[PDB]
């Protein structure tokens, strides 16, 4: 889910590299929330989450404080954190690759979409 | 009177007229809506640092 | 029930000590005052309403029907309905299946005491209605069906043809109704008839059935709470089991009165 | 200057060489990168050299989709802490009307709007992946005339085609045939809402009955006879 | 669900205990098992699956919550009232064996399918010691923590479940049977509990 | 690959020693890969007019 | 010759009524609207397909009818342009036109056509067009005939419900949407009816396009 | 031994006004609780007695619950933990709210882990600070005297049986301290260090108290006297 | 590859160019 | 998931009623013009009154009679509302208060009130009987749900024809539809439902103890008039001056004189709707039996 | 029983009463001070109804909660042993029962001042131990006396009376044998007025006779109000003193 | 069976599609939007066929291949144990 000031996600893996597949879709899976204040490293007060993430993108974010009443607190205020895998037009296009820090482009389709890349 | 809320407004009016002024040094320790002081914070300089 | 962990440790430490101090101060062999009303439903043969000290109230109605015992297996069907709980709820079907075993036609109650002709016999319908409950009511329903069965009157038989019954006279239901008791173990002490707060911090629970001055077959050892669930020494199993053998006659003397 | 009836999946009568500015009804495939219609309606094009060309499809619809720069009528259904919650159409999703989106807005004073109030605003955010947003003042130009609470009156539910042909097409003989019978003020919403208001309730009701009858009747030249009979019926 | 026409009637016709133990062979859940027992004129064949642990959204409990459910298979269909009665007795036992404090704000769902219960000549008393040994194998395969193995035995209706090499009793169940048969029924199941206890470990260590 | 077991859970499993109390007419325990399929068949009768 | 009317309901975004032989199906499309919790899709549009029989409640017979109709409309709608949205598509079968217990092919063929028509009137993004026809073979002549009557089904050996997808003025067939068959047939008869079914659906969309133009065009600039 | 009361035959064993009747026709009155104005005449909405205090006309119902008023010392357990506020069960018609700024936090100004030191079901005592429009009460724990209860047992009495006095809590013989709440929630605990040392016996701009989580810990007192626990049960 | 500008709404396609009054009060007559 | 009504729209319709105005232009006692569309097979009736459209389907089958009434047949009816008539109806909610109150009113009007001849539906006592089923399909909701549904079921039962059955002692042979002409069901009286919607320009207090009745009653409300409705009443009469059934629960507590007035106003309505169904059934019969004048066997002499 | 005389020329009914006489009315207040805040054991004739009122309290879930009024829930449970023949069906989820439960909620949500108790829910639990005709009216009188015991503000009394029409003779308070031989009408009169909050007619009645049936119906309902009112006077006076 | 459409971005005018037999695992059932399920009888007879072409285009090539690949599947199953 994409909100104006947050972005609801769904925890799929975790590392200590090696990972671990989550629960196989249906609910009762670990979910988190990336607050707008922890999206980027610079200008943490004014950001546009619509220009950072889109529904259906795999995002690598580090957890923060555990106020796990329902969700988790994540952050992407680094270089190696952000969108690591996405597709054009929310899955309706081609597989895009992270070029710049906030610019993702698909080679075949040639279209560009603004993300929060991680390279 | 048609809304039958007249007694509720007059009851709150009494609590406003029963308000009492008191200096900051001799104010009650328990925070109350009946007493008033220019300084009602235990450490007033803490809300300025934050 | 729902309590705080601060007071749960206080009741746990006070009930597991060697003095075995109870919350209300009653002795481990004592009970709470109970009010029982009988015979108030003219449309039914037997009836009873029981009221506990903590507020638990249960009503029991008894109906009868002539049925061929050669084709009718069970002659004592118990229908339990708890208010606020679904008919298919997990806590309702367990007592429904448990009471059908303590009052099984032939085991808990002999079928010879309700036979008519060599072909037909009376079928007893025990309808249970729990208005309110704060603990496990299997011991309270047993006290209600006891006074209801001992206050039941069925029509008299007149005598292979279809049986005929008298218009005015009705015979009394001479049936020994089994009794069910609840026991809670707290560490190393036995507690007969626990309370809502005693059973909430207890370690395990015991259900004993008493019939004909003896401990009969249908007994259980279900846990009273999912929080503190502990295994018990076999010496505790026989301690509380033999403990009811001493005070149950004092229960029947006060209940059959 | 070409206008022809097309269908979803039909070929697009536009050369790829010419620069194009597509709009509603036309979709760009994220894979094949071709341009195909997805709606059934009249295909409108306009080739002009000054040198941009545009193309869109005018289709019949009643479910409103939030689009930017649209004049919409909404009903306030919730009061949050930093914004309102408005309903542009039943069953549809909600839109956000912030307290700061008002003339002379300030943190100190909140707008005097309560639930159930009809508002007239401009769609400032219509993202597909986000909640739509409206505002009672054009944040791009500063305009604010007409925007605000529509006190009293009566609202009318019409299709989206009847709303655009009434706001943009100045040749639609509805406001002209209505003003010839009684003085009124109208509020045209692109979400299929037409708010009217007269001095007497008898005139407001007559405006409600004409717009309803003219919404289902496709004959435009029959609007004169509808109001002629409708305003005559209220006289009994 | 078709069930066919309602005008159709069902058909009406006028020492040593072998054991089989298995585990796994299920990909939906985390841990499963399969116990089979053939002795005298009665056979038992039931499958147990453990779907857990699953994190509960919005929960704040201090320890886990076990959910055991017995479902009628295809032969000797018991009544639904007695199925949940044994389940409540099974939950009363495993709430003291499974490490509940290790899995906060989460629950564990148990699914036991009494597929083939057959008699060749209360009938559920003989099946209880076989259901307990099937859940312990399935709970251990799912990586769930259990305080010591849990088993049970039968002694003419009386079913007693022991733990810690039979030192402490975790559950007690009795239906039908006789009177005053207590210490002998305990030792008949105490030696039977050890027969099922070491056999579960022998199957859980093979490859 | 598949592996099946017919007449395994039926009353007529042993053609010489029939079951005393059973209702299933036939069975088939099919397994393809890691999936398990159990198919029992019960019997009834209807009176037609 | 079949009959069809568009825009008959006042409280849905799009409505339709498809009449063929004796089968009559009224469909209603409403969307995009706010979905429920278990229905919303993060990227694309959600579909709530519901079909109902003429007599009795909705049994499991209509459940497979929903799942087959769902597979026809799902690739036909551009779902990705309505993220986190819902579209209710309800099909009400007024008259079956066959035997409900022994057959269920004519109702599937009319629900597909009625749903596509209601999807056009509601203004939903459609990648192409759709056409569905029932096909059966009489055991006498063993030849393929389209839209068989109720008496022709009881003598049929195998039934067919072919659903196609047309583009470029209702001429080029992009993909075969649905071809559900049940009975007795071989590979020689499969392409014997698939080639015949492609030219009977081509004149159907050509007849559908004429119908959906005689009603949408007057409502627009006219 | 058991004492069982038995019956047989039956199912069981000022100005009084009823809802719907006329109490007065004098408009010169102030309509109070249990009273609805209508057509310049006054009627009663509940069954009870008529009260005429000053010009305030009200009806006192027979069975009445607890009415939360400003400045009441009550006892209640936490029902749920919300967003920076905890709904506490006082026993009234609704759940009283407890904002995060109404309790003494040990960290202070320096953290949404509210359930760590105060979860659901935990019992405590506080004072009613104010009321809401719908009648809901707002509590606060800005005093050392108000804290999380422990070292005792909880009981409940009807709300209409608690008399309002000066000191809400009292010290009793046998090293026992009683906490009487006007809502009907009594807490019988052993005398602590606080209730024992207080209940029985120009350049200053005030300072802030430094209170740790010592009063929020669920850890009860280790050694409680066996002679004292039998007094609490008595 | 084509010369594509993002799909625009219905209002930006018109000719008045945002000088449209959505709420027109018809006084007198 | 529910209809949102603006405060401006709510105030306008109430004040319009205070000036004897309805948005659709009817009167306070004007029932919507009813239209009956008969389908192909017998028992296929489509009713259209105003913008509300409803469709009923009549069927029957052999079933076991009740143990307490072995000489009567069964009458089943279920009105499950689909999202077709509006997205406010959640599909699968068969326990809805509207669906519950609709079925119970028609069931009392047809079965309990003796509209359908249940005794004539008995083939063999306590074994075989007819179980007539009435499936009502709500197509487009605009108020008057139970008013149109009752018209659809009554027009459907009078248009439906049950299969012919010959009894040979204990056997029962159901004659195919092509073998023998089906026999129509027996109908004693024609219950027709008329609903009344109530409004108060005052409030609840001025209505409990208020002699001055300022209530506004309208006959057959629309959807917008129904959402702003305060009190609801449903009566059912027949052309025999008999009150079939009455259901009034909640809303504005009205007096006996106004409820009696509602019945006399509803009788003039049901009397006209009755003769229309009798006329439209007569016209539909001549549509199917065009040459029925030549096929008559019982003919008069001279 | 058998073939009885419903209304003989001597004006006597099958149970001895006359045309305008009521069955014995023995109501009881505060019968469950440990199970609900409101309690009423209604014993109208052979009928024996237990009515509980749990509230107003917080809802068990914050999902359904009206921030401007209260939620009124009615749970009518007809026991299996309500009649002579023990019921074999389920009764709880019966369609006839849901109609009664809804008709009771609408009847009282307009009479109970739900506005005085916002953001709350009022649960009404009913258990019928025995029935004998006119069960709907006795359900009405039980809820009225049970809410008053709970201290819920109401505008007036709601009285439940049942009237039957045998040929040309109305009969007050119909029992089971009378309902199985004539048409039945249950009324819901508000206080001493003629305002009807309930009007259920489930059998055919001539229009020329319904008005007189309603007049004699509301007249007997007022008599039912006084018997409930006099019960509250006696209960309040003995409780204070 | 299933008809899967490849892509050049995972190891280019047009492309080539492949046919997968007996779909399994969550990966195939979720992504493959074009399947063919058929009932094959001996002597070249078929009893039921479902042809859904949501994903890739179903060419007559893969129609004939799925039919012939099912006739051998029905012969092995009918002659597996009996």
Residue numbers in the entry:
A (entry chain I): 145 to 160, 186 to 193, 196 to 290
B (entry chain J): 381 to 430
C (entry chain E): 1 to 159, 167 to 264
D (entry chain G): 0 to 49, 51 to 236
E (entry chain F): 8 to 21, 42 to 148, 163 to 248
F (entry chain C): 51 to 99
G (entry chain D): 2 to 223
H (entry chain H): 4 to 16, 52 to 148, 156 to 246, 267 to 299
Kindly provide excerpts from the paper associated with this entry.
The eukaryotic RNA exosome is a conserved and essential multisubunit complex that carries out diverse functions in RNA metabolism, ranging from normal turnover, processing and maturation, to quality control. In yeast, its 9-subunit core (Exo9) forms a donut-shaped scaffold that recruits two 3’ to 5’ exoribonucleases, Dis3 (aka Rrp44) and Rrp6. Subunit composition of RNA exosomes varies according to cellular localization, where Exo9 and Dis3 form the cytoplasmic exosome (Exo10Dis3), and Exo9, Dis3, and Rrp6 constitute the nuclear exosome (Exo11Dis3/Rrp6). The nuclear exosome is associated with the protein cofactors Mpp6 and Rrp47, whose individual deletion in vivo results in misprocessing of nuclear exosome substrates, while concomitant loss leads to synthetic lethality.
